[PDB]
Design a protein around this ligand. Structure first.
Ligand code: HEM
Ligand SMILES: [Ca+2]
Length: 149
Protein backbone atom coordinates (compact mmCIF):
# COMPACT_ATOMS: atom_id res chain seq x y z
CA UNK A 1 0.00 0.00 0.00
CA UNK A 2 2.22 2.77 1.32
CA UNK A 3 2.00 4.49 4.69
CA UNK A 4 5.11 4.09 6.86
CA UNK A 5 7.20 1.04 5.98
CA UNK A 6 10.36 0.18 4.04
CA UNK A 7 10.28 -1.71 0.75
CA UNK A 8 13.27 -0.16 -1.01
CA UNK A 9 15.52 1.01 1.87
CA UNK A 10 15.66 -2.11 4.12
CA UNK A 11 19.20 -3.44 5.02
CA UNK A 12 18.62 -6.47 2.72
CA UNK A 13 17.81 -4.32 -0.33
CA UNK A 14 20.78 -2.04 0.43
CA UNK A 15 23.13 -5.02 0.67
CA UNK A 16 21.63 -6.55 -2.47
CA UNK A 17 22.22 -3.38 -4.51
CA UNK A 18 25.78 -3.24 -3.18
CA UNK A 19 26.97 -6.81 -3.72
CA UNK A 20 24.11 -8.76 -5.27
CA UNK A 21 23.95 -10.78 -2.06
CA UNK A 22 20.50 -11.86 -0.84
CA UNK A 23 20.56 -11.78 2.97
CA UNK A 24 17.20 -13.56 3.08
CA UNK A 25 18.46 -16.89 1.75
CA UNK A 26 17.72 -19.53 4.40
CA UNK A 27 16.15 -17.02 6.81
CA UNK A 28 13.04 -18.82 8.06
CA UNK A 29 10.99 -15.68 8.71
CA UNK A 30 11.73 -14.43 5.21
CA UNK A 31 10.98 -17.87 3.75
CA UNK A 32 7.57 -17.92 5.46
CA UNK A 33 6.74 -14.58 3.84
CA UNK A 34 8.21 -15.60 0.49
CA UNK A 35 6.06 -18.71 0.45
CA UNK A 36 2.97 -16.51 0.73
CA UNK A 37 4.19 -13.91 -1.74
CA UNK A 38 5.12 -16.62 -4.25
CA UNK A 39 1.65 -18.09 -3.87
CA UNK A 40 -0.32 -15.02 -4.98
CA UNK A 41 2.15 -13.60 -7.48
CA UNK A 42 3.76 -16.61 -9.16
CA UNK A 43 2.27 -20.01 -8.30
CA UNK A 44 -0.73 -19.43 -10.55
CA UNK A 45 1.50 -20.02 -13.54
CA UNK A 46 4.59 -21.72 -12.18
CA UNK A 47 2.84 -24.18 -9.90
CA UNK A 48 2.42 -24.36 -6.14
CA UNK A 49 5.96 -25.72 -5.75
CA UNK A 50 7.39 -23.93 -8.79
CA UNK A 51 7.38 -27.31 -10.54
CA UNK A 52 5.89 -25.71 -13.63
CA UNK A 53 2.35 -25.35 -14.99
CA UNK A 54 1.61 -22.67 -17.58
CA UNK A 55 5.05 -21.23 -16.99
CA UNK A 56 8.26 -23.32 -16.67
CA UNK A 57 9.51 -25.11 -13.60
CA UNK A 58 11.74 -22.85 -11.53
CA UNK A 59 12.79 -25.62 -9.15
CA UNK A 60 15.33 -27.38 -11.36
CA UNK A 61 18.75 -26.80 -12.90
CA UNK A 62 17.60 -25.84 -16.38
CA UNK A 63 17.08 -22.15 -17.15
CA UNK A 64 16.04 -20.67 -20.49
CA UNK A 65 17.74 -17.46 -19.37
CA UNK A 66 20.76 -18.42 -17.20
CA UNK A 67 20.86 -14.90 -15.78
CA UNK A 68 18.08 -16.16 -13.53
CA UNK A 69 20.59 -18.39 -11.75
CA UNK A 70 21.60 -15.32 -9.70
CA UNK A 71 19.20 -13.36 -7.54
CA UNK A 72 20.12 -10.10 -9.27
CA UNK A 73 19.19 -11.70 -12.58
CA UNK A 74 15.90 -13.08 -11.28
CA UNK A 75 15.18 -9.67 -9.76
CA UNK A 76 15.91 -7.85 -13.03
CA UNK A 77 13.65 -10.28 -14.90
CA UNK A 78 10.56 -9.42 -12.84
CA UNK A 79 11.19 -5.72 -12.23
CA UNK A 80 12.08 -5.17 -15.87
CA UNK A 81 9.73 -7.72 -17.36
CA UNK A 82 7.25 -5.01 -18.36
CA UNK A 83 6.17 -6.47 -21.70
CA UNK A 84 9.43 -7.93 -22.97
CA UNK A 85 10.52 -11.38 -24.10
CA UNK A 86 11.13 -13.29 -20.87
CA UNK A 87 7.48 -13.73 -19.94
CA UNK A 88 4.32 -11.88 -18.74
CA UNK A 89 5.89 -10.39 -15.63
CA UNK A 90 4.94 -7.09 -14.03
CA UNK A 91 6.65 -5.26 -11.16
CA UNK A 92 4.02 -5.77 -8.46
CA UNK A 93 6.19 -6.56 -5.44
CA UNK A 94 8.39 -4.11 -3.57
CA UNK A 95 12.15 -4.74 -3.82
CA UNK A 96 12.21 -6.20 -0.32
CA UNK A 97 9.25 -8.48 -1.02
CA UNK A 98 11.00 -9.58 -4.21
CA UNK A 99 14.06 -10.69 -2.26
CA UNK A 100 11.83 -12.72 0.06
CA UNK A 101 10.01 -14.30 -2.88
CA UNK A 102 13.32 -15.14 -4.55
CA UNK A 103 14.58 -16.65 -1.30
CA UNK A 104 11.55 -18.92 -1.37
CA UNK A 105 12.01 -19.89 -5.00
CA UNK A 106 15.58 -20.90 -4.18
CA UNK A 107 14.29 -22.93 -1.26
CA UNK A 108 11.95 -24.74 -3.65
CA UNK A 109 14.97 -26.00 -5.63
CA UNK A 110 15.21 -29.78 -6.11
CA UNK A 111 18.18 -30.11 -8.44
CA UNK A 112 21.92 -30.89 -8.03
CA UNK A 113 23.62 -28.98 -5.20
CA UNK A 114 26.49 -27.95 -7.50
CA UNK A 115 24.11 -26.11 -9.83
CA UNK A 116 22.79 -23.90 -7.02
CA UNK A 117 24.93 -20.91 -8.01
CA UNK A 118 22.67 -18.70 -5.87
CA UNK A 119 24.10 -20.32 -2.74
CA UNK A 120 27.55 -19.61 -1.31
CA UNK A 121 29.87 -22.35 -0.07
CA UNK A 122 28.21 -22.57 3.34
CA UNK A 123 24.61 -22.43 2.12
CA UNK A 124 25.37 -25.17 -0.42
CA UNK A 125 26.43 -27.32 2.54
CA UNK A 126 22.97 -26.82 4.03
CA UNK A 127 21.11 -27.35 0.75
CA UNK A 128 18.54 -30.14 0.62
CA UNK A 129 16.08 -30.85 -2.24
CA UNK A 130 12.69 -29.37 -1.38
CA UNK A 131 10.11 -31.94 -0.35
CA UNK A 132 6.37 -31.28 -0.29
CA UNK A 133 4.85 -31.33 3.17
CA UNK A 134 7.64 -29.24 4.64
CA UNK A 135 6.44 -26.71 7.20
CA UNK A 136 8.43 -23.63 8.13
CA UNK A 137 7.95 -23.15 11.89
CA UNK A 138 5.20 -20.56 12.33
CA UNK A 139 6.91 -18.91 15.29
CA UNK A 140 10.06 -18.31 13.25
CA UNK A 141 11.57 -14.87 13.82
CA UNK A 142 14.26 -13.25 11.70
CA UNK A 143 15.16 -10.37 9.42
CA UNK A 144 11.62 -10.31 8.03
CA UNK A 145 8.54 -9.13 9.88
CA UNK A 146 5.78 -11.76 9.52
CA UNK A 147 3.11 -10.79 6.98
CA UNK A 148 0.42 -11.93 9.42
CA UNK A 149 1.90 -11.48 12.92
C1 HEM B 1 6.75 -12.45 -9.26
C2 HEM B 1 6.13 -13.71 -9.86
C3 HEM B 1 6.94 -14.53 -10.88
C4 HEM B 1 8.27 -14.91 -10.85
C5 HEM B 1 9.34 -14.64 -9.80
C6 HEM B 1 8.49 -15.61 -12.06
C7 HEM B 1 9.77 -15.96 -12.52
C8 HEM B 1 10.06 -16.45 -13.79
C9 HEM B 1 11.38 -16.77 -14.26
C10 HEM B 1 12.66 -16.64 -13.45
C11 HEM B 1 11.23 -17.20 -15.53
C12 HEM B 1 12.32 -17.67 -16.50
C13 HEM B 1 12.69 -19.13 -16.29
C14 HEM B 1 13.92 -19.59 -17.06
O1 HEM B 1 14.77 -18.77 -17.42
O2 HEM B 1 14.05 -20.78 -17.32
C15 HEM B 1 9.83 -17.15 -15.84
C16 HEM B 1 9.28 -17.53 -17.06
C17 HEM B 1 7.92 -17.49 -17.41
N1 HEM B 1 6.93 -17.04 -16.57
FE1 HEM B 1 7.15 -16.34 -14.69
N2 HEM B 1 7.34 -15.72 -12.83
C18 HEM B 1 6.39 -15.05 -12.09
C19 HEM B 1 5.05 -14.90 -12.47
C20 HEM B 1 4.49 -15.34 -13.66
C21 HEM B 1 3.09 -15.26 -13.96
C22 HEM B 1 2.03 -14.67 -13.03
C23 HEM B 1 2.95 -15.79 -15.22
C24 HEM B 1 1.71 -15.80 -16.16
C25 HEM B 1 0.84 -14.55 -16.31
C26 HEM B 1 4.25 -16.22 -15.63
C27 HEM B 1 4.52 -16.81 -16.85
C28 HEM B 1 5.78 -17.19 -17.31
C29 HEM B 1 6.04 -17.74 -18.61
C30 HEM B 1 4.98 -18.02 -19.67
C31 HEM B 1 7.38 -17.93 -18.68
C32 HEM B 1 8.22 -18.40 -19.87
C33 HEM B 1 8.67 -17.22 -20.75
C34 HEM B 1 9.81 -17.51 -21.72
O3 HEM B 1 10.27 -18.65 -21.83
O4 HEM B 1 10.27 -16.59 -22.40
N3 HEM B 1 5.19 -15.94 -14.67
N4 HEM B 1 9.11 -16.68 -14.77
CA1 LIG C 1 13.73 -24.42 -15.03
Amino acid sequence: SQGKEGGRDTPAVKKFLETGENLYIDDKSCLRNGESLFATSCSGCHGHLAEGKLGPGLNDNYWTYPSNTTDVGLFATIFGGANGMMGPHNENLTPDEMLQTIAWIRHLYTGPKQDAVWLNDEQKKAYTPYKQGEVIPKDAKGQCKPLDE
